[model samples]
Target: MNIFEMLRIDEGLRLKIYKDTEGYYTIGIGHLLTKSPSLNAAKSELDKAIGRNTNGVITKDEAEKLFNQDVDAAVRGILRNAKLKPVYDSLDAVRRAALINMVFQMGETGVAGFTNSLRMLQQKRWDEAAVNLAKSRWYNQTPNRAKRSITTFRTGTWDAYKNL
Candidate 1:
């Protein structure tokens, strides 16, 4: 099945789908990877992506410029397990989409770290949900990103699926 359809987004986020796990956003989604360059971050991100989804890794072209197949077949295999299917299937469309977006940001392990947060989502405990989200390792690496995503769950104003 097409990944986009499986994820339930009618017309996917395209290049904007993932900022943390996927390849560098090539064109308009431009920025320096780090203020002080580290081959480690680039190499690590590339390795993890390639290790997770061969197509998701960016090819090294020139400094900061990138290009590669973003098919990301690996990502689906990682998340679409029996344990998550029913839970994911039961979620409201908007909630499901947003949850997938968060999982996309944080890997399966990262999303799983929100064990308390997931339950709170089911209970509609938005405040506790946001609190649980803030207590993860992801918050350290991408503080603003985690905050923004949880804020989306809270007030529903995050850039990803905010309108939904």
Candidate 2:
């Protein structure tokens, strides 16, 4: 499907898409504003980025273009939200991407909802954050989703889902 088509744009959807996408981006990291993609770069970047999960499955039905754009928006939002920035700023790219996936799955409100966990992260208390992530009503709402999300947050008993 076309990247634009994968976006599944409607009037309201288009507006939401644009709202999420508006940002100053550049290639690689650190530049402000988005760079234009070469056709090949765009396709390859879109292929790897859009519609695919961190685990590399194509779970999203949105177009590669839309999905890529959304990922950018989501990452940008993570950078903007101070509440999330504590842990997000410290993570390596892979973990940053992991957090991006989490943000896309669970909004800042969802992270904030785990006030206990957020508090730990804010204090740079990873052990506690790891613990709180596993101990929450988050999964009661969606266990599978929670497990997938929590898995990336850490490993082993720290990541209880690893046993699942």
Candidate 3:
């Protein structure tokens, strides 16, 4: 499946503000409103996007728009890394989407911290890469999602998302 579809399943949709696992104010497909420069700015932008004062609520259409924007940023952020670009470009569409999915969940720097995993990925050592990914706190924190990502990296296919 495509990145958007995959992320929609993973992140889940929310029409109202809620605290994420980290207790951050989030909305609209895991969008972290608290991560913006300021809560006021985030609210202003949300209101502007949906064309009304939402009072911490948004429409499905607005959520889709935000999701699209977030995915665009995640893709661009991954490509912007000098060390990641060539490796990211070397992968097929499925693997590339897998990287994008990781970046979406954990920002570029967060994914970059997987030095050994990234090295394995760059070498096209799928099993090694999956192993490296699994040996982490990220895996412990979100076992199911981590398993899916590991399987995607290992198999270089969308099979992990089959029933998702």
Question: Can you give the TM-score per candidate against the true fold?
Answer: 0.49, 0.50, 0.90
lDDT of 3 by residue, 1-164 (tens): 78888888888999987777766678899887765546676677667766789988988998998898999999899889976787798898889988988888888999888888888899999987888899899899989988987898899888988987
- lDDT of candidate 3 at residue 104, scale 0 to 100: 86
Question: How do the residues 88-159 of candidate 2 rate in per-residue lDDT, one tens digit apiece?
Answer: 777654445556655655566666466676666556565566777877665665566566555555531223
Kindly give the number of clashing pairs for every candidate: 0, 6, 0
TM-score of 2: 0.50
How well is each residue in 52-96 modelled by candidate 1, as lDDT tens digits?
443333433421232112224223633575444554555555456
Query: Measured by TM-score, how close is model 1 to the native structure?
Result: 0.49
Candidate lDDT scores, in order, read 0.48, 0.47, 0.85
* RMSD of each predicted structure: 8.6, 13.1, 2.3
Better of 1 and 2 by lDDT: 1
Model 1 has a clash total of 0
lDDT of 2: 0.47
Write the number of the candidate with greater TM-score, choosing between 1 and 2: 2
Please list the residue runs of candidate 3 whose C-alpha ends up more than 4 Å from where it truly belongs after superposition. Answer: 35-52
TM-score winner between 2 and 3, please give it: 3
Model 3 poorest ten-residue lDDT run: 33-42
Q: Which segments of model 2 are wrong by more than 4 Å?
A: 1-62, 122-127, 156-164
Candidate 3: residue 100 lDDT (0-100): 89
